[PDB]
Design a protein around this ligand. Structure first.
Ligand SMILES: [Mg+2]
Ligand SMILES: [Mg+2]
Ligand SMILES: [Mg+2]
Ligand SMILES: [Mg+2]
Ligand SMILES: [Mg+2]
Ligand SMILES: [Mg+2]
Ligand SMILES: [Mg+2]
Ligand SMILES: [Mg+2]
Ligand SMILES: [Mg+2]
Ligand SMILES: [Mg+2]
Ligand SMILES: [Mg+2]
Ligand SMILES: [Mg+2]
Ligand SMILES: [Mg+2]
Lengths: 63, 50, 31, 62, 50, 107
RNA sequence: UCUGGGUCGGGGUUUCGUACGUAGCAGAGCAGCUCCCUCGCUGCGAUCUAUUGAAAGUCAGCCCUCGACACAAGGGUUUGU
RNA sequence: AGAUCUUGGUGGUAGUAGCAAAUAUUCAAACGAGAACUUUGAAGGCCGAAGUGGAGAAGGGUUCCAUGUGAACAGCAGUUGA
């Protein structure tokens, strides 16, 4: 269905922007059950929600 | 189209007995094949296919 | 154990994006 | 059939092709195209242009 | 056809046949081969097939 | 046979020539889907995302001149669909496009 | 059809101008290695040289293939003195 | 029958003008009767810290957050929504 709430909660729980929020496309239904931040914590612990790394902005060219 | 170089034989002109360039057109003309004949009759209204 | 068939299908799960993207680390379901 | 010319590039210019240039000092040049002409007007040495005949014979290419 | 422009003998001397797909600068294939010499394309072609 | 897959190359540069800058990348895949329909004769076409990356590899307007794809017409007995067959196209990375011919490839 | 049209490929033509890589006792030079050497070796170094008139593109509204590939006697609507 | 009459309704115009200020979208899957517009994932872009960011004052007053619906509204769609 729609994961608008889950993405917002995952961004709030991980204290990162919605840009870096990543979800497992295959396990859509299990994540759709997450109606609380406590359940979000389980999904992160279960790895279904993953914080994407910071996009690379290297300063080697400047150096 | 293309261009050529030829000798000019126009007396009294500045290009007489000289060399000039002239653009020419190449038109392919394979031989025709005749398949029919139509004759026309001269009516007071003009021409019509007899 | 990680045999040829398991390593064949592991490449699908661990890859979540193209070149330059981070690799998937875990996938566990537990009740 | 006419006089057959040579250019900045050293190439052979056929009749009806290119242009002819006459400077103030009296020297007369002919160019196969604009590219050979533009290089000449930019004051560039044809011995440093790889497709110029003068460069090829300078380095004995071929 | 009365005027001297008409009824005037025409003799050809040279015809442009260069590549009109751009600034053509060779009338024939052979002169292009002669002027430019053997290229990399013909060098390998005569070397692979032997 | 009705399940055979094949390898093709597409002159994207030829089929994009004349299209504006901000539409070159979308037109490439529209041509690709049309190209897939023309050969495999199946209106239902699926485009692999890796190939979609390959079209978008050099941005939106400098679309690669040629691409090498692998058409796969597969039996679509998955649900109630008017087409029994669907064409899945995949991107085949190549080092060069010289002397490449359309080859019949096994499954 | 004595096949046809396509899609690639090849070739021709053309545009720009000599590709990456490799090598060079070429390189303003600079830094480490000298029982070493009797003038040397190992790194950095824009550029230059042979490869290399090379590399790339070339009909989508350029040309010729007989090389490869499948496809094409299929679909629908009408038309009578 | 009028009074550029008053009120209410209905035409041609006409399926016409038009839906063009601020660069840009694409592929796959999911839900669904139905997806160019929803959700996720994968790209390519944009705002480029005097922002399309992060919080307020005035003002708005429940628009806030869930769950559900697809009657009307979001000048198209909407499985979405202030
Ligand atoms: Mg022309
Ligand atoms: Mg070609
Ligand atoms: Mg009245
Ligand atoms: Mg009256
Ligand atoms: Mg009135
Ligand atoms: Mg109008
Ligand atoms: Mg209109
Ligand atoms: Mg508009
Ligand atoms: Mg920017
Ligand atoms: Mg702000
Ligand atoms: Mg309704
Ligand atoms: Mg509407
Ligand atoms: Mg709300």
């Amino acid at each position: 269905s729609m994961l608008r709430l889950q993405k917002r909660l995952a961004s709030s729980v991980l204290r990162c922007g919605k840009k870096k929020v990543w979800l497992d496309p295959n396990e859509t239904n299990e994540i759709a059950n997450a109606n609380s931040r406590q359940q979000i914590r389980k999904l992160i612990k279960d790895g279904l929600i993953i914080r994407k790394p910071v996009t690379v902005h290297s300063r080697a060219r400047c150096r | 189209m293309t261009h050529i170089v030829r000798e000019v034989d126009r007396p009294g002109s500045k290009v007489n007995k000289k060399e000039v360039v002239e653009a020419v057109t190449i038109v392919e003309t394979p031989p025709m094949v005749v398949v029919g004949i139509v004759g026309y009759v001269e009516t007071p209204r003009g021409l019509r296919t007899f | 154990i990680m045999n040829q068939e398991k390593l064949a299908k592991l490449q699908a799960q661990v890859r979540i994006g193209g070149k330059g993207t981070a690799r998937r680390k875990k996938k566990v379901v537990h009740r | 059939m006419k006089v057959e010319l040579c250019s900045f590039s050293g190439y052979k210019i056929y009749p009806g092709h290119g242009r002819r240039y006459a400077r103030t000092d009296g020297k007369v040049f002919q160019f196969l195209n604009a590219k050979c002409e533009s290089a000449f007007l930019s004051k560039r040495n044809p011995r440093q242009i790889n497709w110029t005949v003068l460069y090829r014979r300078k380095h004995k290419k071929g | 056809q009365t005027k001297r422009r008409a009824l005037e003998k025409i003799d050809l001397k040279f015809i442009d046949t260069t590549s009109k797909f751009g600034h053509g600068r060779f009338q024939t294939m052979e002169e292009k081969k002669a002027f430019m010499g053997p290229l990399k394309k013909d060098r390998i072609a005569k070397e692979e097939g032997a | 046979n009705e399940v055979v897959t094949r390898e093709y190359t597409i002159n994207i540069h030829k089929r994009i020539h004349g299209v504006g800058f901000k539409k070159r990348a979308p037109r490439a895949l529209k041509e690709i889907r049309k190209f897939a329909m023309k050969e495999m004769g199946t209106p239902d076409v699926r485009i692999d995302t890796r190939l979609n990356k390959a079209v978008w590899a050099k941005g939106i307007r400098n679309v690669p001149y040629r691409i090498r794809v692998r058409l796969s017409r597969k039996r679509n007995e998955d649900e109630d669909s008017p087409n029994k067959l669907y064409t899945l196209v995949t991107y085949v990375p190549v080092t060069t496009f010289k002397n490449l011919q359309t080859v019949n490839v096994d499954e």
